[PDB]
């Protein structure tokens, strides 16, 4: 079970990274 929690947390981390990068790009373009 704890293996499933572990993989879930790791994929959550990847998704958070993707979203953070996308928001930085969005802010940079919204300035323009």
């Amino acid at each position: 079970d704890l293996y499933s929690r572990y993989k879930k947390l790791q994929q959550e981390l990847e998704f958070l990274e993707v979203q953070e990068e996308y928001i930085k790009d969005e802010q940079k373009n919204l300035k323009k």
């Binding site: 704890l2 790791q10 981390l13 990274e17 979203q19 953070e20 928001i23 969005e26 802010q27």
Partner: protein
């Protein structure tokens, strides 16, 4: 009793990282919304 402590410490690391990242993303979303 089997390898729990290792799973536990590693999940603790991921949890700390993900919490910090969520706070960063919240701030960043607030700025972009403004």
């Amino acid at each position: 009793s089997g390898l729990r402590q290792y799973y536990l410490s590693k999940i603790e690391e991921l949890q700390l990282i993900v919490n910090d990242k969520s706070q960063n993303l919240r701030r960043l979303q607030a700025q972009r919304n403004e």
